[PDB]
Amino acid sequence: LFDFNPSSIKFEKYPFYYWINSSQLTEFNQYRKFVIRDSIIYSLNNYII
Amino acid sequence: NVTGKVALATLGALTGYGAFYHYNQYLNLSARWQQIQENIAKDQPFDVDGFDAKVYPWVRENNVNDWEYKLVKMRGYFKDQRFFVRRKRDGKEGFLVFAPFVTAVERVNHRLKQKDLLPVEYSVFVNLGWVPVENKKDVELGGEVCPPMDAPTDSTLFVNDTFTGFNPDPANPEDTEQVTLTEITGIVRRGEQQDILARRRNWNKEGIYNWVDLDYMGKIFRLFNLDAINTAYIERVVPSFEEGEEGLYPIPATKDTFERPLNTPERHSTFFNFYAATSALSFISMLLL
Amino acid sequence: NSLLFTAVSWFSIYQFARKGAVLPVLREYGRYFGTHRLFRQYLHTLVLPLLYTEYA
Amino acid sequence: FESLNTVLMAPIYSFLEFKLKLSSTKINTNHYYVINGKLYITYNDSFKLFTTINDYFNDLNELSNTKLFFLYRSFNIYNIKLNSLVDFVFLKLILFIHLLYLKSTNYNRFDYRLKQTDWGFYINNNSNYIQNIFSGLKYIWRGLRFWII
Amino acid sequence: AHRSNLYQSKDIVGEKSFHEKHLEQQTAPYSGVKSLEEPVSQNKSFINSLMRAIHNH
Amino acid sequence: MNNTFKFLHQVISKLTLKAQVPNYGQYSHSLKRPINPKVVVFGNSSRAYELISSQFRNFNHVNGLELKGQEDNIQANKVAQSVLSINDGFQDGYYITDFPQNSKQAERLDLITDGVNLALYIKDPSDKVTVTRQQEAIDYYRKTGALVEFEVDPRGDLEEQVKQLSNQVLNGYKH
Amino acid sequence: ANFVIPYLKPVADFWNSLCIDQHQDSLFQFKGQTGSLGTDWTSKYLRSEQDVYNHKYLQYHKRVHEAPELTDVISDNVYRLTLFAGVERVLSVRQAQAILKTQFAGATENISGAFQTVLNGGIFRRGYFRGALLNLLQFCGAPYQSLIWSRNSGITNQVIVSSIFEAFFYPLDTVKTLIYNDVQGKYKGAFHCASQVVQNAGWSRLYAGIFQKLIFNSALIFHLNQVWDGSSQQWASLALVAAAYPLLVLKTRFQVAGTPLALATSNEVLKVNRKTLYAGLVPYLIFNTLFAYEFAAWHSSTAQERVIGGLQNAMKQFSSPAAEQVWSS
Amino acid sequence: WCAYFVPYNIFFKTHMPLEHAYDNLFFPYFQHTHFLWDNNALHIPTVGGVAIYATYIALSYINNIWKDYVVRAQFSKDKELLFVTRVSPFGTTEEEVYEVAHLEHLPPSVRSGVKDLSAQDADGLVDVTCMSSQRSLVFYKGDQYWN
Amino acid sequence: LAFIKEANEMIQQNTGNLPWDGGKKKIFQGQANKYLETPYYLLAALSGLGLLY
Amino acid sequence: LLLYILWLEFYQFYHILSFYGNINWAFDYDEYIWTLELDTRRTRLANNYI
Amino acid sequence: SKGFNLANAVNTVKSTLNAPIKHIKRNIEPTGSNYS
Amino acid sequence: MEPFGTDERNWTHEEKDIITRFLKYDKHVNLKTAEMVYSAEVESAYFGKAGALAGGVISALFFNFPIVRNLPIIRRSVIGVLPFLYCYTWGKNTQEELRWLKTFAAYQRFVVYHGQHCKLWV
Secondary structure, eight states, X not given: OOSOXXXXXXXXXXXXXXXXXXXXXXTTOSOTTTHHHHHHHHHHHHHHO | OHHHHHHHHHHHHHHHHHHHHHHHHHHHHHHHHHHHHHHHTTOOOEEXXXXXXXXXXXXXXXXXXXXXXXXXXXXXXXXXXXXXXXEEETTEEEEEEEEEEEEEEEOOOSSTTTOOOOOEEEEEEEEEEEEESTTTTTOOTTOOOSOOOOOOSOGGGSSOOSSSOOOOOTTOSSGGGOOOOEEEEEBOOOOOXXXXXXXXXXXXXXXXXXXXXXXXXXXXXTOSOHXXXXXXXXXXXXXXXSSOSSSOSSBOXXXXXXXXXXXXXXXXXXXXXHHHHHHHHHHHHHHHO | OHHHHHHHHHHHHHHXXXXXXXXXXXXXXXXXXXXXXXXXXXXXXXXXXXXXXXXX | OHHHHHHHHHHHHHHHHHHHHHHSOSOOOOSEXXXXXXXXXXETTEEEEOSOHHHHHHHHHXXXXXXXXXXXXXOOSSOOHHHHHHHHHHHHHXXXXXXXXXXXXXXXXXXXXXXXXXXXXXXXXXXXXXXXXXXXXXXXXXXXHTTOO | OTTTTTTOOTTOOOOOOHHHHHHHHTTSOOOOOTXXXXXXXXXXXXXXXXXXXXXXX | OOTTTHHHHHHHHHHHHTTTSTTSTTSHHHHTSOSSOEEEEEOOOHHHHHHHHXXXXXXXXXXXXXXXXXXXXXXXXXXXXXXXSOOTTSOOOEEEESOOOOHHHHHHXXXXXXXXXXXXXXXXXXXXXXXXXOHHHHHHHHHHTOEEEEEOOSSSOHHHHHHHHHHHHHHHOOO | OOSSHHHHHHHHHHHHHHHSOHHHHHHHHSOSOSSOSOOSHHHHHHHHHHHHHHHHHHHHHHHHHSOOOHHHXXXXXXXXXXXXXXXXXXXXXXHHTXXXXXXXXXXXXXXXXXXXXXXXXXSSTTTTTTTHHHHHHHHTTHHHHHHHHOSSOOHHHHHHHHHHHHHHTHHHHHHHHHHHHOTTOOOOSHHHHHHHHHHHTOGGGGGTTHHHHHHHHHHHHHHHHHHHHTOSOHHHHHHHHHHTHHHHXXXXXXXXXXXXXXXSXXXXXXXXXXXXXXXXXXXXXXXXXXXOOOOGGGOOHHHHXXXXXXXXXXXXXXXXXXOOOOSOO | OTTTHHHHHHHHSOSSOXXXXXXXXXXXXXXXXXXXXXXXXXXXXXXXXXXXXXHHHHHHHHHHHHTSBOOEEEOOSSSSEEEEEEEOTTSSEEEEEEETTTOOOOOOSSGGGSTTOGXXXXXXXXXXXXXXXXXXXXXXXXXXXXX | OHHHHHHHHHHHHHHTOOOXXXXXXXXXXXXXXXXXXXXXXXXXXXXXXXXXX | OHHHHHHHHHHHHHHHHHHTXXXXXXXXXXXXXXXXXXXXXXXXHXXXXX | OOOOOHHHHHHXXXXXXXXXXXXXXXXXXXXXXXXX | OOOOSSSXXXXXXXXXXXXXXXXXXXXXXXXXXXXXXXXXXXXXXHHHHHHHHHHHHHHXXXXXXXXXXXXXXXXXXXXXXXXXXXXXXXXXXXXXHHHHHHHHHHHHHXXXXXXXXXXXXX
C-alpha cells in the first residue's frame, strides 16, 4: 500500500520478445530438450528481423 | 403528344448510338479477321517443348491475347477423358470435343522403389475437334488422335528432357517411366464466356454444356494445371483434309473451318443493322409527329 | 491520444462558445496582451497534452 | 462566364466577408426606437414592440415555426379518394350483411334450450345479432395471439 | 371529423413529435460571444476581432 | 357499423389518412396551427385587451371599430382583403376586433374568406358593451361552432389567464 | 419437405454463397483424382489459399486488359448502385435546396433538412429510393459509353470522351434531377415528367448545366486518376476539385430553373448569395471519397503497379517464417 | 437472434466449439458433429416444446407489462363508463371500459414511501386504480396530455 | 419574398379570389378524374393469351 | 437469464457428450484421399467421473 | 443554418438520460397492497 | 514455447498470424496438424461474413422500425448502424476465436510432436 511498488510496464509490440533462448546470460541450464525451441526461436527472430 | 415525341427521340438516339458502336465493332472485327487469316496462311508453328511446355509462353507472360490466333506445334501426351460441349459444326448440330494433352511430367519420388507414386502431370487441354450429333457414340475415350512422333535421332535424347521431362525411349528401362509422346500443330482460341443472350448456357448438373468453362472442365477431368488450363484452351487444327471421309469423330479443324468467334463481324453487322433500322424508324416517326 | 484530446477540446470549445458556454478557468481578459479567454484556452489545449506525453 | 467569375470570387467573397466580420463589431444600436411610449425595434421593413429579449426570441420562434410549417400545414383538403373508398367498402359490406339477415328471429335453438334449463345466470338473447358478427373470430384471434409465433 | 382531427383528441395540446422538436431545436439562433461584441478597446485588437468573428458567426 | 368491424375500419382509415398528409402523426401538433389565421374578436375590458395583446403579439390587429357606417358587403370585402395577405415579414395572422356586430355581415365575410380560423368571445364581467353590439354575431358564431368563450375573472393571475387563453385558442383554431 | 423446402432452399443457398467462397467450394466439389498429383483436399486448400488474391488479380487484369462489361462496373460501383444509391438523390436535393421551398416544408437549410425532406417520402418508390431507376439508367449511359470509347487512353483523351458522352446524355440527367427535385410528387414517372417538361418549356432546358457538368467531369477525372495512382497528391486533386465544386452546384441549380418546385427564376440564379455555392460541398466530397466511382479500365500505370504489389505481398504471405536456409538445396 | 440465429450457426455450421465450452473441462481437444448425437432424438421434441413455450411466455409477459399503461382515454357522456384503449399484445390497441366509482388514487401502504413515489415528480406518472376489477390505468402525470 | 408572392397568389386562388381578367373572371376551377385503362387492357389481353396457350 | 443459462448448459452438455466419441479425418495417400473415422479414447478415470 | 450544436446535443442526451426515470419509478413505487 | 504465467504478456495478433503461417507450411509439422490447421482456416471464414451480412440485413429493418421511422436523421442513422456493428463484431470475433483456438490446439499438437513442453514425458 504505502511503499515502492514493483513496476508492471513491459514491452508489448515486438514479435516473440518474451521468447528467450539459452545463452551465457542464461547459463544454458534450460530444459534438456529445449534446444529445438531455441533453434525455432532463432529462426523466427531471423524471420522477424 | 409530348411523351410520345420524347420517347421516340430517346429511342432514336439510343438506337443510333448502338448502330454506330456496332458498326465500328464490325469494321474492327473485319480488320482483325483479315489479319488472322493472313497470319494463319503462314503456317510457322512455334515449338512447345522444354521450358516452354512446362509453362506455356502465353500463360508464362499472362499475354494470351497477345499470342492469340497463332500456330503452335506442341508436344504432349493425350488424356483418356474427352469432353464434349454442345456446338454447331458447319451448321450441323454437334459437339466440340476437347482432350487434355499432358505436356510435361514431374517425379518427386526420392524413394522411387519404396513407394510408387503417380507422376504430377502438367497438362494443357486441346480441342480435339468437332463431331456431329449423329456420331455421338463414335468418340472413343482415349482414342488415337494421330500417329506419334518418331524416335529421336540423338542417342542423348533417349531420356527424360531437361525441362519437359518426357523420355522418348522406345524401350525405357524404367517401365514405370515408359511413355509414347505425341506432337501436333494447331491454332489458338481464347476462353469462351457464358452469355444468356448468346445461348452459351450450361446445365452442369444435368450434363448439358454450351459455354466453354475451362475451370469446370478442369474440375471434371482432374487436371493438375488448373489455373494454367483456365488461362486459355487451344482448338486443334489440321493441315487440310481434317476429316475427309471416314467414321472419324470428332472431325478436326482445317484452315478455313475453325470455329469463328461468337462476337463475329457478321453478328456485329447484324446488330448494327438492327440498331440502325430502329434509329431510322424512330427518327422518321419523330419527324411525322 | 494527445491529438484526439486536443481536437475534441477545440471542437467542444468552438461549439460551446457558439452557444455562449465558456469556462473561465483562466482570466477572462489576460494581462499585458489582453488576449481573450477563448484564445488562451485554445493555446493551453494545444500545448498541454504534448507536454504531458513528453513527460511520461 | 458569370458563374466562372462567381466561382473565382467564391474564396474572394468569403475572404471579404471574413475581413468585414473581423473589422466590424456586432453592435450598431440602430434598431431600437421609442415609438411614443412603446419601445419598438426594427422588424424587417417595420417595427415590433420589445418587452424582453426572451419575448423577442419567442416572437421570432413563432414566426419561424409559421414559416417552416407553412407548406405542410397547407395540405390539400379534398384529397379524400382513399378514405371515401374505404367508407364505401365498409358501407357495402354492412349493407350486404343487413340484406343477408333481413328476416331472422333473435332466439335460436340454444335460446329455445335456454327456456328449458335452470341456468338463470345465463340470459336469453333478445336483440339483433348484426353488430357482433364474428365475435367468435375476434376471440379466436385473441386466443391465437399468444400461441402463433 | 376523425380524419380532420387526425384521430387525435380535440382540446388536447399533446406532445410535439420528435421531428417537430428537432424543428424547434434547429431553428433557434446561434449565441455568439456577447462579451467579444463589447465596445472595449481590449476587444478592439486583431486577435480579439478574429475571435469575435469566428465565435459570433 | 358493427362492433366487430370498428377496429379494422379505424385501422384502415388511419393508414389511408397518411396518403393526404405524410408524417401526419409526426406533425399533428404542428398541423394544429392554422394556415392563414383569421380571427374575430368580441369583448372589451382592460384584462381583455391585455389578453388580446398577449395572444396576438405576433399577429396583426384590424381595427374593425374604425369600419363603422360602411355597407355590410364593403366592410366584409375590406376585412377579407386585410386578412387575405401576408405582411412583408410573412405575418398573416390577422385578428379583426370590434367586428362585425351583424350576423349577415359575418356570413358574407365567411363566404368571402372560407371562415375565420378563430372566433373569440371574452366572457369577462368587466366587459359591458360588447354583448350590447355583437349578440347576433355571437349567435352566428355559436351556430357555426367557432365561438370560443374565455371566462376571465377581473382579478387573478394575468399570466395564468394568458396561458389558459393561449391553450384555448390553439386547441380551438379551425382549419 | 414437400411444400416448404422446395422454395426455402434457394434462400439458404444464396446466403451460404454470400457467406462462403464459391470457387473454393467448387474445388471441394469434385473428390478424387485422374492420375495427376495435387488433387487431394489438402492440395485444393493449399491452391485455394493463394487463389483468392490470385483470382482478384486475374479479375483486375480482365477489367484492365480486356473489354468492359457493365456488370463489372456495377460490381465496382455496387455500394454506389444499390445501397448508397439514394445518396445521389439526396445530394441532388441538397444542391437544389438553395432554390427549393423546403424551408417552408419543415426542412432545415442543411444536410439534415435535405435528408428529412428526402426521408419525408419514406423508404419506397417515393422515398429515399425515389428516382433510383433513372439514376441507374444514367449510370448505365455516359460512364459506360465513354469508358467503352477510351479503355486505357490518357487523361486528356479520357476527359474528351467523357465530355462527349456527357453532352450526348444530358436530358436523362436533367429529368432525373427534376424528379429528385420534385418534392411534392407532381411527376408521375419519368415519362410523364418528360412530357410535362417538353410541353411546358422547350428542348433547350435539358442541358442548362452541360458545360459545368463537363468541367466537373474533367475535374473528377483528374481526381480519380490521382486517387488511383495514390500519388499523395490525391489530396491535392481533391482540394482542386473542391475549388471547382461550385460548378456542379450551379449546374444543378440551372437544371431546375423557373419551375413549380423552385420559387425563383433563371435570372435569379445569378442573384443567389455566394454562401450557397458551398452548400453540400462536405456531403459531396464525403460521397466521392467513401463511395467513390471506380473505372478499373481507366486506372493508371501507378494504380496497376500498386494493385500488383498488394497482390505480391498477399502471395508472399504464404511462406514459412522459421524456415532454415541450407547450404545444399 | 440470441436464441435462434446464433444457435443455428454455432451448433450446425461449425465443428469447433466456443471457448466457453472448454474453459472448465481439462480434457484433450476434439471436434464436434451433430450427426452422431441423440440417436433416440429426445432433444428435438424438447427443443421444440421449449422454444414454443418460451415464445408464448415472452409474448404474454410483454403484453402483461404493456397492458397496465393507459394510451387513450375518453370519459363517457355521463362519465360513468370511461372507455380506454391500451396496448394490445400484437402491438395494436384494445378497448375496455371502467366504472367511475372503481377508479381512485390512494397513499401507498408504506407512508414513508410517499417521497419516493413516481407521482412526486412534476412530469411523472399517476395510477388510477379501478377497484372493481382491481385494474390499473397509468396516466402520464403531466398537463400536456390531459384535456 | 418570392415564397410570399407565390403563397399570396395561391391563397387568392384557394379562397376564391380568382384573377379578374378583363371582365372574364374564372368563377370555377377544378380537375377531372383519369383512370388507368392501358394497364387493365394489357392485363386482360395477357390473361386471354395465357388462357389460350 | 434462465434461457441464456439453459443455452450455455446445452452447449456444455453437447461438448461433453462429444469428447466421448473421437471422430477424426485421416489422409490415405494410397488412394490420395482423406476419410473420417471414429475410435475410442483413453483418458483419466477422474475426468470421466467429472 | 447551424448543424450539430454541442449544447443541443447535450440537451438531447440529458433528456434521453431522464427518459426512463418515470417508468422505473412507477415499477419501483410502492403499491397500496400488503399481503402479510 | 511461449512464456506461461499471469504476469506474462498475452499473445499478440501479429504473433498469432506468424504462428498460424508457420504451422501452415512448416516442414517440421506433421500432416495431421497440417490438415487440422487447413480445416480450421477453411471453415472459420464463413462465420464472419455471415455475421456481417446478418448485421446488414437486420440493421436495415431496424432503420425503418415503428419508432425508428419518425426520428431525426442523426438518431435514426445511429440506431440503424447499431445492429450492423454488433452483428459484424460478433461474426468477426467468432471467426477469429475459432481460428485462434484451433491454431493454439495445433501449436500444442506440434509441440507434443517435438516434446517441446516441460514435464511432458512419455
